[PDB]
Amino acid sequence: QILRGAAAAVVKNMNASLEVPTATSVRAIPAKLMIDNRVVINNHLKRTRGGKISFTHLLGYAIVQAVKKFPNMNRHFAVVDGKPTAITPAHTNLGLAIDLQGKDGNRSLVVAAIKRCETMRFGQFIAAYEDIVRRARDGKLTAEDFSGVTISLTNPGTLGTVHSVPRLMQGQGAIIGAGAMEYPAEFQGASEERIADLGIGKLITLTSTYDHRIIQGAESGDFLRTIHQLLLDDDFFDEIFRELGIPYEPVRWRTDNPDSIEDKNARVIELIAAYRNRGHLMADIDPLRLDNTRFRSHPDLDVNSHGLTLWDLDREFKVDGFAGVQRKKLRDILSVLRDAYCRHVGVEYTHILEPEQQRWIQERVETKHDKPTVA
Amino acid sequence: GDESQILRGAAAAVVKNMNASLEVPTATSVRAIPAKLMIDNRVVINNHLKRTRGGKISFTHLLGYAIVQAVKKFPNMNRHFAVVDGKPTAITPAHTNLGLAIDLQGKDGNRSLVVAAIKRCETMRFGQFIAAYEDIVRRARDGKLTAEDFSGVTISLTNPGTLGTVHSVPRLMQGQGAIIGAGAMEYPAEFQGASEERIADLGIGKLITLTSTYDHRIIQGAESGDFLRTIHQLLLDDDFFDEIFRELGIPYEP
Ligand SMILES: [Ca+2]
Structure with missing residues (x-):
């Protein structure tokens, strides 16, 4: 029987929290949306200025914005001079389970609080x-x-x-x-x-x-x-993409297209050519970002318009010689086109009449080009 | 820290009741039931009632009725623990009164959540x-x-x-x-x-x-x-829906 010392503080808090009558609401949320959006967020951040968004970043932010909608979720019960008074804190401070691996392996689990969250945007x-x-x-x-x-x-x-x-x-x-x-x-x-x-x-x-x-x-x-509404919303990801410097349209929660792969194939073939004809029209080539609507004012480049959803992203399509491969997953196809055309280099090569010249630019544009050396 | 502590008045009654439930040692059993049967049966029930005399059955009607009939099978589910003169005596009520979570949307939006009771449920058929x-x-x-x-x-x-x-x-x-x-x-x-x-x-x-x-x-x-x-046996049973169809004036097979 070892008497507790530092951990005894944790033991007394469990005994103190016994006077609190609690209940638990449980709910399952499909995460396929924030997973496929994180795919783009961390790739775009890696190719521009660093930084990495984890699933907890999105989760905690939604908690903070939902606290604004429900005020009684921040408040806590207290008794002042024998009265049932409920404290209403000024700042919504989100406590985090941060496990600090100590000097001798002692995993010191702390509760650090991000303060003044209600007065913050996704960046802050x-x-x-x-x-x-x-x-x-x-x-x-x-x-x-x-x-x-x-x-x-x-x-x-x-x-x-x-x-x-x-x-x-x-x-x-x-x-x-x-x-x-x-x-x-x-x-x-x-x-x-x-x-x-x-x-x-x-x-x-x-x-x-x-x-x-x-x-x-x-x-x-x-x-x-x-x-749940936030984690599957479109404006939630629109706000997050704005704060992260991503000008492109985020993935939207769309329920599977019940069409066959043959029916979906001709749509994907056509969408590739559409990205080649006007890749420049939705690219981030304006350094001043004056017209923010140029990114959203194009249905010929929007995937949702071509009878496609985030569920079709992992399916194979018979893309005749797109990235050399005769078969490719949809998320790979839209990543080649993003980095090749809609990044900082708009390409007008489809209007040329010589065929080998188009073939030439296709190879030099639709390839994951090597990052230049530090020298 | 720029906080506002408001003394509770009517809601204070709710707070003291949550303290009383602290002495009750609670444990919870959870079970998933496929509802595709009562959904497709409700389809017929509300269509037949609409085309003959009005009336609408909600999913809670079926749910509460099954709870009441299951209470008859298990008697200890109606009883509640109590202490009479320092003795562990358990009250065995005469009538099984099913509590309903009725949210009354008040005059100024104040959603007053009440617990109404349907009494003498054990002496009832689906109609009653x-x-x-x-x-x-x-x-x-x-x-x-x-x-x-x-x-x-x-x-x-x-x-x-x-x-x-x-x-x-x-x-x-x-x-x-x-x-x-x-x-x-x-x-x-x-x-x-x-x-x-x-x-x-x-x-x-x-x-x-x-x-x-x-x-x-x-x-x-x-x-x-x-x-x-x-x-669960009731919600997927055939005689349960046979009894309900009889009480609702539906002659067809559920
Ligand atoms: Ca499951």
Whole structure:
């Protein structure tokens, strides 16, 4: 029997949080949208100025914006002079489960709080998140950071745990348990080609244990619905792409096109030629970004218009000699065309009458060109 | 830190009730039931009722009725723990009064969530049950509920699945033996992206994640686990729908 010392502080907090009558609302959200959008976000950031967006960045941001819609989710129950008074904090401080691997292997799990989140845009939020991350990683966190957690987030889904029912400490209104973003247990045995061909996508089991003294089942149930609406919304990703300097149209949650691969093939062939004819019309060649509508005012380049969805992204199409390969996945086809035409080099080569000249430019444009040497 | 602490008045009653539920040791049994049967049967029920005499059956009508008939099979599900003169005595109520989560949208938008009770459910057929349900609904909607309606809830039912919340782990209040949390009747998250023509061609159906949080001082995991199994047997049974069609004046085979 070893007496607890530093961990005894954690033990007393579990006993203190026992007076809190909690309940838990659980909901599954299809994540196939933010997965396929992260694909573009981290590729575009890597090819321009660095930076990497993780799934928690999007998750925490949606939590913060949903807190604005539901005010009682930030508040926490308290008793002042024998009165049932509920504290309404000025700043919505998102607590994070940051596991600091110590000097002798001691995994010191801390709750760092990103403060003044309600007064932030996607850029300001991820800047304050990465400050709290860079400083926690190098042990430079002040004691003031740990004081002020009004609402928090945990990720038991890191270890593959589908969903959890967390225990809520005093001082908080609710704590969101983000589940395991993955394919369900039954599908784990089938081939990827089988799954994408039917239209089954990965999902996150988002839980929300809340204080039942102040927050009631309807408010917490609607709070999780609101987060679901954001994670599958179009304006949410429109705002995120604007803040990340991405001028291109983000992926939209579209339900599978029930057409055959033969029917879809001629659409994909035609879309390739459409990107070759007017790749320059939707490229980021204006350094001043004066006309922001040039990126969205083109249906001949919009994939959703050509009878295609994010589900068709992983399917093979008989693209006759596109990137040399006679067969290619849709997400590979749209990535070659993005980097070749819609990046910073608009190409008008289709209007030339000599054929070998078009063939020549096609090879020198539709290839993943090597990044120049540091010299 | 620039905060506003408001003293609770009417809501303070709700706060002190959440404290009383702290002494009730609760555990929750969760079970998913394919609802494709009651969905396709509701299709016929509301079409036949519309073409003959009016009336509309909602999914909660069928759900509450099955809860009431399952309570007859398991008696310990209606009972609630109590202490009389320092003795562990369990109350066995005479009438099984099903609690309803009725959200009354008030005068200034104030959604006053009440717990009305359909009484003497054990002595009822499908017709008598839905008549007593619609009386409690029509009167709650127009603020004509007596204080006598709220006193007597022996077993309650909540619907977090209204807002799309897959399943919930509710908090059980004192005076109730068990409270059932009806999940969201829908297709799972993964399938949400595929076409309807794809789904029906394979044979995948909608489902409801029915939860059951109970008082561990009297009810045990096996009884609550079997209670939910019994409800599932009913929601996919043939005689259950045969009885309902008889009570609704539908002569055709369900
Ligand atoms: Ca499943």
